[PDB]
Amino acid sequence: GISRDNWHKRRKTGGKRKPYHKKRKYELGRPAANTKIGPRRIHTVRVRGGNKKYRALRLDVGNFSWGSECCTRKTRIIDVVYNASNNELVRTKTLVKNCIVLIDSTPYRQWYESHYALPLGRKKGAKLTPEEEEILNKKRSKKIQKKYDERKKNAKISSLLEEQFQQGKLLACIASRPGQCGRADGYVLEGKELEFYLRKIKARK
Amino acid sequence: ARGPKKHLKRVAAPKHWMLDKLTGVFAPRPSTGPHKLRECLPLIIFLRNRLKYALTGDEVKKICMQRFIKIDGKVRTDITYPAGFMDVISIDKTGENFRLIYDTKGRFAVHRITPEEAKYKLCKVRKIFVGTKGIPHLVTHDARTIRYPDPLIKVNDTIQIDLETGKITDFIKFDTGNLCMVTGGANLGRIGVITNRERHPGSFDVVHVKDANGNSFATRLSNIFVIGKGNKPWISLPRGKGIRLTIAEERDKRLAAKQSSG
Amino acid sequence: ADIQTERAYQKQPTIFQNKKRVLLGETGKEKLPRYYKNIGLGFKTPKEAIEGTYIDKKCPFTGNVSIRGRILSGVVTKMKMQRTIVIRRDYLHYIRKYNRFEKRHKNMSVHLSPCFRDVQIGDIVTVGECRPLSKTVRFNVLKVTKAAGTK
Amino acid sequence: MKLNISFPATGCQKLIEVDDERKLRTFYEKRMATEVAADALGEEWKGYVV
RNA sequence: UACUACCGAUUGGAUGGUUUAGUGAGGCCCUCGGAUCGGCCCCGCCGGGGUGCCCUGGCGGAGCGCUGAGAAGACGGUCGAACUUGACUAUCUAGAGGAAGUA
RNA sequence: UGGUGACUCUAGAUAACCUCGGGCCGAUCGCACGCCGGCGGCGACGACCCAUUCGAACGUCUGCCCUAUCAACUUUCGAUGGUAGUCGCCGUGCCUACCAUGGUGACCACGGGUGACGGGGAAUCAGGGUUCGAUUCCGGAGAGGGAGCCUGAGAAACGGCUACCACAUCCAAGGAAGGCAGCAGGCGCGCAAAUU
RNA sequence: AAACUGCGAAUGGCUCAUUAAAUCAGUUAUGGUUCCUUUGGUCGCUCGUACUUGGAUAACUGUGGUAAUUCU
């Protein structure tokens, strides 16, 4: 019986309307299904026209895109850190649109070394397992080492991202609506937006 | 209402069907189809009210259910099927072919055409879009979509369909100097030559048409159907040539038809 | 500062602004490319629109609205809300029995883009119909002409 | 009680009326779809589980 | 000689409408719940085929095996008729007394 | 590539994702029979998507009777607006969070009344007017009063369901069933209206 | 015949209680939506037992309960 009608509101002058018709079905609202972080649990809503909606009630994974590199990978979701609308959607860890979220970085790390042949997020102890040595220090052809070193002239990240790759957790912002399509998708925060949300998280805590 | 309506009262039926008051409470209520229900002839009205082949709706059911009526080359057993502007109604058993063309008073005439003419029709292109791997599309005024038209065909042009294949043979462009029929409004059923088109952005354009006797009239752009190129129509025209007589000269013609006949 | 006053990061949604680049452009000239469009009814986009730095999602020139419907005009009376003003439209209504007229008026809350700075009261705005932007706001300021005395 | 008793091996049924509460002690406080050895029903009912 | 209408105590009783406070039928959503019903396994009695082993074929048995489906019910949330007690207000009715005018 | 007065349109290119309460990519039916074991002619029922038709729903502008013995109202419990969301078929205070203090009014707001459903129309009429319109066409609303839902393309459906309130039926007293402001008909009400 | 399946039962009919910028009328808009059906398009565009797959359940047969239902 949640409704979205205009006729229960005051007029612009401030006088109250009398209702002339009672609640219709096309003016209905549904409960505000709050997504959490957990193993995947998605319910299905039958909507107007016979179409279909997806209430994600629990998500743990969704794909986020590195905007500068154009690298989109499916990635585990760690934690919610900042919600720009309410602060109580953070202590409850609710996933909605435009919320700031901590994601994994290892699908972006494995793409970065496979494409640019540089270490990223490695410690100064430099303990390297023999798995990634044969992709970081492979034997390769002259024409192919030419291409791999021609890529290395621009393979430079901001310092604000590499300290996140040090901890294995990038910062991302959800761009889709998880109550309406059952997915948590988005993009990795970079640049002015990144330092904006960094000082917001800094001032909030 | 709680949903779509299925009846039509007889007084609220379109005026050009020329139904009368006392034979019933209801009108035939056209089915959904290629033409709008304010702009169509249902097949039951054409077959007993115009052609007088039937005397009831039951006899129209009996005539149509013998698969004797082809509208645009396909058999229609629906008795309220909306036939419309420039559809070819072809009855094979009697050897007749008809095309629905407005009279000078804005009603569909019983226009008989030769079976040479009954293999084509003209359509007005209403929408062009490119869809799903760059295939261009048409949408005509009777809900046909055509893949891969000629790239010179633009919106408001008039193309020619072959009724068996469904493909374009040729087309007319929208330009001043071509011939029209008005398919809407006060000027409905009149025929003349385009002389002008004034473009008002954000609203409807106005097209000025000149009659064969020098009369001139405007319509909107959506009420314009390009018949022919220059002065030659690509179809046969009805009894009046799209020249609306005034009531005085119509009275004079009707009186001159009595002092000579008899 | 000077844009980011809200709790969420304001940006034009159509312009990507984290395109990586080499230091000869990363240090040389720093300019966010601005999105703007041309509304279609002969109205020309102001200079402050295409070069400004404000972020308004309801602006007719740099935001996501379309202008379609009725072109009207009123006179500014109240400038007291955030990015939206109140205009007054005066007209004469014909009473038929007396063959005469009476002065009526109607108010309109209308959205004012930040590209029209130096808008006083008493001057004539041209408004264009858009989609409903608020509970009572349906129009959008398209052109400002000054009052009679402001030289 | 009456006892609508069936036998799905040959599909023949029978209604036996038992007006003796000593026999019905076996079925009390049970549930549906729980098997009970029907020894208390008589003497022909020895190896019978219903 | 009678009517008319008021105040009217009764805070008569009953009913309605606004609100304070308290309660909350029912559906829907959510977190559980798991009465029951299957399948795949594991053995037993064992045919055929291929080769003591495997696939089929019939069962039967048990295993908190491991999964699928799943009703009652309950915590919570929401929508929310109604219920109780107030306050204000209105009406219908039982009601002593009287007054004036009405004739 | 194409279009519009105007796109953040259509089409294209790249990187991925693609919901167990799963998206499409045919395990369906008839008739006539066949041509060189294959290749088949008409239909019927389907089907994601696109377009069309019938709509629907939200908006734009102007327009309504009496009342000031109704002059200030709205804002606690959204009032007016901004930002981000949630929900919705979508636009939007529709709802939430945080901010701003706005919005309407003697050009009559707000409140009340109406023996007020609104129009097309009707009677009267020198010209101007005045009164009526429940009523067969169009639009709205409601099925005793409120409320909540299921199914479905479409309903907050009542010749569907679930409650409460008021009435009311059958009963073996445990329970069960209801909704004529459809057609008839009855009672009542009345000055006032027809055939089970 | 029955029964399962599909569709329709949201139209029509009735009434005028509510309702005073509300309804409604003329005008516009959806570039801000959904749409059974009809009509046209699309339906080897996908590079990865089929000469046909599996479990049920009505109608029917048979045994019943309740004072009582279009109960089961």
How far apart CA A100 and CA A16 sit, in angstroms, is 40
* Chain G bases closer than 7 A to any CB of the protein: 9-12, 18-23, 28-32, 34-42, 45, 61-65
Residues of C with CB under 8 A from a CB of A: 4, 6-9, 11, 16-20, 22, 109, 135-136
Cβ pair C76, C125 in contact under 8 A: yes
- H or E stretch covering C59: none
Tokens for B15, please give them.
């005026």
Cβ pair B152, B189 in contact under 8 A: no
Protein B133 CA to nucleic acid F22 C1', in Å? 28
Enumerate neighbours of C (3 or more CB pairs within 8 A): A, B
Q: Which of B81, B70, B65, B159 is nearest to B120 (CA)?
A: B159
Tokens for A25, please give them.
């079905």
How far apart CA C109 and CA C84 sit, in angstroms, is 7
How far apart CA B159 and CA B153 sit, in angstroms, is 8
Q: Is the CB of D10 within 7 Å of strand G?
A: no
What residues does each domain of chain A span?
Answer: 1-30, 31-105+169-205, 106-168
Tokens for A86, please give them.
């309410």
Question: From the CA of B202, how many Å to the nearest CA of chain C?
Answer: 7
Tokens for C120, please give them.
């006083």
Give the angle subtended at the CA of A167 by the CAs of A161 and A171, to the nearest 5°: 50
Q: Which residues of A64-91 are buried (b: 16+ CB within 10 A; e: fewer)?
A: bbbbbbeebbebebbebbbbbeeeebbe
Q: Which of B156, B138, B219, B137 is nearest to B186 (CA)?
A: B219
Q: What are phi and psi of B31, to 5 degrees?
A: -70, 165
Q: Is C20 helix (H, G, I), strand (E, B) or coil?
A: coil
Using left for φ > 0, alpha for ψ between -120 and 50, and beta otherwise, residue B151 falls in: alpha
Cβ pair C56, C62 in contact under 8 A: yes
Question: Distances from the Cα of B179 to the Cαs of A71, A121, B174, C76, in angstroms?
Answer: 59, 75, 10, 51
Cβ pair B76, B35 in contact under 8 A: no
How far apart CA A198 and CA B194 sit, in angstroms, is 67
Place of tokens 């041209």: C126
Experimental method: cryo-EM
Question: From the CA of B203, how many Å to the nearest CA of chain C?
Answer: 9
Residue B202: its chain C contacts at CB < 8 A? 40-41, 68
Protein A73 CA to nucleic acid F100 C1', in Å? 42
Q: Which residues of B95-109 are buried (b: 16+ CB within 10 A; e: fewer)?
A: eebbbbbbbbebbbb
Q: Which of B251, B154, B134, B237 is nearest to B191 (CA)?
A: B237
Q: Which of C38, C57, C79 is nearest to C134 (CA)?
A: C57
CA atoms within 13 A on the CB side of C65: 26
- H or E stretch covering C24: helix C23-26
How far apart CA D22 and CA B154 sit, in angstroms, is 95
Q: Which of A64, A89, A90, A67 is nearest to A76 (CA)?
A: A64
Residue B90 forms beta bridges with which residues?
A: B70, B97
Distance of CA A187 to the CA centre of its chain: 6
Protein B73 CA to nucleic acid F37 C1', in Å? 40
Q: Indicate the DSSP class of residue D37.
A: B
Q: Which of A75, A147, A143, A68 is nearest to A115 (CA)?
A: A147
How far apart CA B84 and CA B101 sit, in angstroms, is 8
Question: Distances from the Cα of B59 to the Cαs of B41, B44, B53, in angstroms?
Answer: 18, 9, 9
Name the nucleotide nearest A31; use CA and C1'.
E29
Residue C40: its chain B contacts at CB < 8 A? 201-202
Tokens for A43, please give them.
């319910």
Residue A36 forms beta bridges with which residues?
A: A58
How far apart CA A163 and CA A168 sit, in angstroms, is 9
Question: Which residues of B spanning 183-212 put their CB closer than 7 angstroms to strand G?
Answer: 202-203
Sheet (strand B179-182) strand order: B216-220, B206-210, B191-198, B179-182, B224-226
How far apart CA C34 and CA C53 sit, in angstroms, is 8
Whether C40 has its CB under 8 Å from any CB of chain B: the answer is yes
* Chain E bases closer than 7 A to any CB of the protein: 26-31, 35-37, 77-80
Whether B200 has its CB under 8 Å from any CB of chain C: the answer is no
How far apart CA B109 and CA B239 sit, in angstroms, is 9
Closest by Cβ to A68, choosing from C7, C8, C19: C19
Question: Which residues of A spanning 44-63 put their CB closer than 7 angstroms to strand G?
Answer: 48-51
Rg of chain C's alpha carbons, rounded to an integer? 19
Residue by residue, DSSP assigns chain B as --S-----BSTTS-GGG---STT-SB---PPSSSS-TTS-EEHHIIIIIIS---SSHHHHHHHHTTT-EEETTEE---TT-EE-TT-EEEETTTTEEEE--B-TTSSB--EE--TTGGGEEEEEEEEEEEETTTEEEEEETTS-EEES--TT--TT-EEEEETTT--EEEEE---TT-EEEE-SSTTTT-EEEEEEEE--TTS--EEEEE-TTS-EEEEESTTEEE-SBTTB-SS---SS-S----HHHHHHHHHHTTTT--
Residue B207 forms beta bridges with which residues?
A: B197, B219
How far apart CA A112 and CA A96 sit, in angstroms, is 29
Q: Which of A65, A64, A44, A66 is nearest to A55 (CA)?
A: A44
Cβ pair B88, B112 in contact under 8 A: no
Q: Indicate the DSSP class of residue C14.
A: T
Q: What are phi and psi of B71, to 5 degrees?
A: -110, 120
Q: Which of A118, A116, A101, A114 is nearest to A170 (CA)?
A: A101
User: For chain A, what is the HEC assignment?
Assistant: CCECCCCCCECCCCCECCCCCCCCHHHECCCCCCEEECCCEEEEEECCCCCEEEEEEEECEEEEEECCCCEEEEEEEEEEEECCCCCHHHHCCCECCCCEEEEECHHHHHHHHHHHCCCCCCCCCCCCCHHHHHHHCCCCCHHHHHHHHHHHHCCCCCHHHHHHHCCCEEEEEECCCHHHHCCCCEEECCCHHHHHHHHHHHHHC
Q: Which of B44, B2, B4, B40 is nearest to B24 (CA)?
A: B44
Q: Is the CB of A36 within 7 Å of strand E?
A: no
Place of tokens 């115009």: B50
Tokens for A68, please give them.
């500068």
CA atoms within 13 A on the CB side of B196: 9
Find all residues with CB under 8 Å of B205, minimum gap 6, and list them.
B197, B198, B199, B220, B221
Sign of CA dihedral A177, A180, A181, A182: positive
Q: What are phi and psi of A204, to 5 degrees?
A: -75, -40
Contacts of B202-205 with CB under 8 Å at 24 or more apart are: B202/C40, B202/C41, B202/C68
Q: Is D27 helix (H, G, I), strand (E, B) or coil?
A: coil
Q: Which of B180, B193, B178 is nearest to B223 (CA)?
A: B180
Q: What are phi and psi of A36, to 5 degrees?
A: -120, -175
Protein C11 CA to nucleic acid F115 C1', in Å? 63
How far apart CA C8 and CA A189 sit, in angstroms, is 13
Whether C68 has its CB under 8 Å from any CB of chain B: the answer is yes
> Integer distance in angstroms from the first to the last C-alpha of chain B?
57
Helices then strands, each counted (H, E), chain D: 0, 2
Q: Indicate the DSSP class of residue C47.
A: H
Q: Is C91 helix (H, G, I), strand (E, B) or coil?
A: strand
Q: Which of B212, B228, B231 is nearest to B86 (CA)?
A: B228
How far apart CA A196 and CA A16 sit, in angstroms, is 43
Find all residues with CB under 8 Å of D36, minimum gap 6, and list them.
D26, D27, D30, D49, D50
Rg of chain B's alpha carbons, rounded to an integer? 20
Q: Which amino acid is at C49?
A: A
- H or E stretch covering C51: helix C47-51
Cβ pair C1, A194 in contact under 8 A: no
- Other CB atoms within 10 Å distance of the CB of residue A43: 12
Find all residues with CB under 8 Å of B163, minimum gap 6, and list them.
B72, B73, B88, B118, B119, B120, B121
Q: Is the CB of A15 within 7 Å of strand E?
A: no
How far apart CA A187 and CA A157 sit, in angstroms, is 16
Q: What are phi and psi of A71, to 5 degrees?
A: -130, 115
Tokens for B204, please give them.
């409807």
Q: Say if strands A36-37 and A52-59 run parallel, antiparallel, or are unpaired.
A: parallel
How far apart CA B192 and CA B177 sit, in angstroms, is 9
- Other CB atoms within 10 Å distance of the CB of residue B202: 13
- Other CB atoms within 10 Å distance of the CB of residue B132: 6
Sign of CA dihedral A96, C58, B200, C44: negative
Question: Per this entry, what is the length of chain D?
Answer: 50
Question: Distances from the Cα of C63 to the Cαs of B252, C60, C79, C140, in angstroms?
Answer: 65, 6, 21, 12
Sheet (strand B111-112) strand order: B74-75, B69-71, B88-91, B96-99, B111-112
Cβ pair A50, A10 in contact under 8 A: no
Cβ pair B140, B159 in contact under 8 A: yes
Give the angle subtended at the CA of D12 by the CAs of D10 and D13, to the nearest 5°: 145
- Burial classification of residue B4, based on how many CB atoms lie within 10 Å of its CB (0-12 exposed, 13-18 middle, 19 or more buried): exposed
Give the angle subtended at the CA of A148 by the CAs of A144 and A152, to the nearest 5°: 160
Question: What resolution (Å)?
Answer: 3.0
Q: Indicate the DSSP class of residue C128.
A: E
Q: Is C23 helix (H, G, I), strand (E, B) or coil?
A: helix
In this structure, the dihedral spanned by the alpha carbons of residues D12, D15, D20 and D24, taken in order and rounded to 10 degrees, is 60
Answer whether A197 sits within 8 Å of C9, measured CB to CB.
Answer: yes
Place of tokens 């004539």: C124
Cβ–Cβ pairs < 8 A, chains B and C:
6
Residue A95 forms beta bridges with which residues?
A: A35
- Greatest CA separation found in chain D? 30
Cβ pair C82, C105 in contact under 8 A: no
